[PDB]
């Protein structure tokens, strides 16, 4: 099997800057017939892959002029003139000259964008889930940048750190921001004893914390 | 273009047959190749078949573990995997590279454990918490096996102001969430619903997010 190795592993770019992805094969990809069977594919997460360039430099229909395929023999390069919001995802170099076809490890591309503060939203457990024995208090932290952030859950003043389940979404392809969900799963008995529930979020955009809460009593 | 079968919780030791069906075109004129993607690693080429004469080739790692066949009649290609184990729990795609046709993917979980359907809970906001002229609502889909789940707002009508968070596994059961921010005017006037389809157990669930009252 022929090894395809690409660099870098990740790549940050300010919307507008160029970018380059390199790929190196353990063997030449020039077939005896004069053809180099190498391609570059893109994949934005949880979607079917898409081919950008094939045969090293030919571009597929409906692929912007800014995607250039270069290289020969064992070294090939993928170049993006100006990087845009929609370019976020993973890129791979794929060889089909030797059998079996092998794909490189892929390269994830991220975008450096201006900083943003998350718009917070807290949610009390649906009664529908209450009458089943449990209680999920969810908090949504949306459209913010950079990725790094943290969330504390405070019940009646005291901080809790278990039951918590967090999820981050990939960098949005429209505004390059993020979002994150944080839910605190507890029993209904535990839930009904306590009144005040809080969701504290601290983000680079401010040292002072974004505080969203609700008092299970008046609603 | 290319429709593929749904997710399948099949048990260890078993076999499985995946179908890929072409519509807009005729699969004779193309080579149908299948690629594996263990959603951690990259793509792994499995093999390919020339449906016109059912002529195929398989990667060394798949000889004897994969079988490719085609049905020129119903415009369908198949990839039958045998002796499934934990190494096969992946997402397989069928593809016709010539003109770049892909199928949405078929998730496959090899596990002994049984299928569980998710419980969908609408998330409507506390006492009119009003952040401006917008309203943010959610849908908590939890307790299901296996992946994936397919969530949409109003069968897809709500194509913006949506955030569908990756599912996190916990105690051998997944959990997922989604949000939707809209203008203060629409909801509650115009109703909102999140459809959750757990194809692994032929389950479709629509939840009308209604304004809470005495609770």
């Amino acid at each position: 099997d022929v090894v395809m190795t690409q660099t870098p592993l990740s790549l940050s770019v300010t919307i507008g800057q160029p970018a380059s992805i390199s790929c190196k094969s353990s063997q030449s990809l020039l077939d005896s017939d004069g053809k180099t069977y190498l391609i570059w594919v893109f994949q934005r997460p949880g979607q079917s892959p898409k081919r950008l360039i094939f045969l090293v430099s030919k571009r597929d229909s409906g692929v912007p002029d800014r995607f250039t395929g270069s290289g020969s023999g064992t070294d090939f390069t993928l170049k993006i003139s100006r990087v845009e919001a929609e370019d976020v995802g993973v890129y791979y170099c794929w060889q089909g000259t030797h059998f079996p076809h092998t794909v490189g490890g892929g390269t994830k591309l991220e975008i450096a964008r201006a900083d943003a503060a998350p718009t917070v939203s807290i949610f009390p457990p649906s009664s529908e889930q209450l009458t089943s024995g449990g209680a999920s208090v969810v908090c949504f932290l949306n459209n913010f940048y950079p990725k790094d952030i943290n969330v504390k859950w405070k019940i009646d003043g005291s901080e809790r750190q278990n039951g918590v389940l967090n999820s981050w979404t990939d960098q949005d392809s429209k505004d390059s921001t993020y979002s994150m969900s944080s839910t605190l799963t507890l029993t209904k008995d535990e839930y009904e004893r306590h009144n005040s529930y809080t969701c504290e979020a601290t983000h680079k955009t401010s040292t002072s914390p974004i505080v969203k809460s609700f008092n299970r009593n008046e609603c | 273009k290319l429709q593929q079968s749904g997710a399948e919780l099949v048990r260890s030791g078993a076999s499985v047959k995946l179908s890929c069906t072409a519509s807009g075109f005729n699969i004779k004129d193309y080579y149908i190749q299948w690629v594996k993607q263990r959603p951690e690693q990259g793509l792994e080429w499995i093999g390919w078949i020339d449906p016109e004469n059912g002529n195929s080739e398989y990667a060394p790692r798949f000889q004897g573990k994969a079988t490719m066949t085609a049905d020129t009649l119903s415009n369908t290609a198949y990839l039958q995997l045998s002796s499934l184990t934990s190494e096969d729990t992946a997402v397989y795609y069928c593809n016709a590279d010539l003109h770049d046709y892909w199928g949405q993917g078929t998730t496959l979980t090899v596990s002994s454990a049984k299928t569980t359907a998710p419980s969908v809970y609408p998330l409507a906001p506390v006492c009119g918490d009003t952040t401006g002229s917008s309203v943010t609502l959610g849908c908590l889909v939890k307790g299901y096996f296996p992946e994936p789940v397919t969530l949409t707002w109003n069968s897809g009508s709500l194509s913006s102001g949506v955030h569908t968070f990756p599912a996190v596994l916990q105690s051998d059961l997944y959990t997922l969430s989604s949000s939707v921010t809209v203008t203060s005017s629409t909801w509650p006037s115009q109703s909102i619903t999140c459809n959750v389809a757990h194809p692994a157990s032929s389950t479709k669930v629509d939840k009308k997010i209604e304004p809470r009252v005495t609770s």
């Binding site: 053809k35 069977y37 076809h101 | 190749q33 390919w48 020339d50 080739e57 590279d97 010539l98």
Partner: peptide
Amino acid sequence: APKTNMKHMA
């Protein structure tokens, strides 16, 4: 054929 953009079947 041509049925692919990669190397054809032998």
